[PDB]
Amino acid sequence: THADSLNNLANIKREQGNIEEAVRLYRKALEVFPEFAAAHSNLASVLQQQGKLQEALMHYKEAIRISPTFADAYSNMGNTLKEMQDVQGALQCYTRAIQINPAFADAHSNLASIHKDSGNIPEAIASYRTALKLKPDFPDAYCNLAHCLQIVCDWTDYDERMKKLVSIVADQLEKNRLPSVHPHHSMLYPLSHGFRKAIAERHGNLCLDKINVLHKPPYEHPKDLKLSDGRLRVGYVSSDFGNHPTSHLMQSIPGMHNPDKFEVFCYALSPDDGTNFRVKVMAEANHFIDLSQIPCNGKAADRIHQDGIHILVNMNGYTKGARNELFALRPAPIQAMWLGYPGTSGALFMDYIITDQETSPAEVAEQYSEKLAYMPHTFFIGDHANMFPHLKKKAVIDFKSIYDNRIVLNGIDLKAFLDSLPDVKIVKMLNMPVIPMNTIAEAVIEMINRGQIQITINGFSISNGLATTQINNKAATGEEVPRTIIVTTRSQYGLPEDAIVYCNFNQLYKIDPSTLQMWANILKRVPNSVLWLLRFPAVGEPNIQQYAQNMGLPQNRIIFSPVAPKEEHVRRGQLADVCLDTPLCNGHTTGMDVLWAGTPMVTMPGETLASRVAASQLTCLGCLELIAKNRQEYEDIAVKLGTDLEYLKKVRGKVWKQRISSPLFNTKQYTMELERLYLQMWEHYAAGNKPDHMI
């Protein structure tokens, strides 16, 4: 009972976030009573929370040696092994805990989550249901289940699920517990803004709690640029310097920074994945530091501080791989959110969020903990001009008597190939070459029809767009620019030659009932037309098809293709007529992708950062006619583009040209504007002031 009171106290000091004190109390409990299984297990769990994974494991095992049937110890040990990347060990522990006690809800829940992580959503759903059957009041499992259902577009009892999620959050916030809705998912659910911000705030808080065990004094911050030779030292922190959307967006930025005024440090939180993305940022940043080698957040934060950073840039927010503990320690005087996280941190330790007028209107400053820092056009950027320059121009094959998106060719050497051909006509839009239906045109269509990998014409390499990984797998990933001419066709994807193709290439989770109802209305108004979606994941397809069948759409109206390699995904968007953006959460990376192909995108900005990104893209692009202020307008715009064909041609021509002539894909201009904004942020603070809106 002496030992128990120590243990019970420790448990509460832990509930509180007083980790150091909890650890001490458990140790004292074990000094008093060494064979205390519960204290070993609890101590193990808090060591795990602090990253001491081997030590934890040792205590979990002592706990199990003391009590062989301690299912809880196995379950938590399983989580430790999962944190160590030992999936097999984790499964062994979870399944052992369930064997010991099949009514143990938490174990079922932990098992479900490793199913989810491994790509087995149906089994994850099943285990979360078992968990909730065993323990109907289980917020973590209910909300995790809700996300799985979202991913596969299972909208059974949707509206009740939604308000169930809201009440769960309200209750948890009431009681100052950690909300079971992850901040990153909070945009998908009809929560209030105060709730979205609060959720983020409470998750930020976990980082503050973890760093207090270190007891660091505040860091002292440069007040001028004298020791940096008049250069603003900017630190980009990311787990995504590698093959990840982030790098696909901003890999050129570090090397475009003006070294006369800036000194760029990239802090990677991930190890080198061997990809050209990582190679490029390592090569072009003035300094590159691999913090994945320095897992103690104390020592890593010191490094940032000695480097002398003025502006530290948080590119993760609440995404996989984050180490926001680093920002909690405030190792730099100005700390800003940029690009990677489409929401607020809700945290005190972040000063600004880099955004824009269209994405984050001044009116909604309430929704963010950070001050608004406006880029002048969009805060979004993409590396498409560098990654996919072979898509800057295109030619077509005139299969009948003229379409821009049925049979398409792209290539760095396309001009030379076309010049080798007898009868090429040039359609002014600047222009689109047209290969007439001759023997050449026939050989190409025959390679495609026969699913052959490539052929040669007049000494030029002509590649089947479906076979890029077999020809050059670095060109498929976007790590290299293709060195052959590539052919892309509607027939390759079973798309109709003679109808409008509306597309959306986002993960299926971004779709909701209202959204699919809009799409179905649009398709009913445009007979012939199809909606082109991805198996992202495949098990979402029959759900989408069923809800569409119930809205009165025959099945052939929605066509699914597999997820493609990066370059093919971007290239194949040239086959669509129009992209219908997801209002609940827009295409972000995905939006830049579709626009680079010349494909107009219809969107309806909403009430969250994530639902307004596409509209910002389109604004910067200069295509305000594609932004809807409501559902009727979205449908009307979309029906207009699918029926008024001269208007379609006009609007496509405008996107096709403005992707070059506008700022949207202009990384040099973006970097220079980003540099102005950085100096504004710097003056305002050097002049002794503190964070305030910048517009």
Partner: peptide
Amino acid sequence: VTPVSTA
């Protein structure tokens, strides 16, 4: 595999 933004 196709990397994506995740929580």
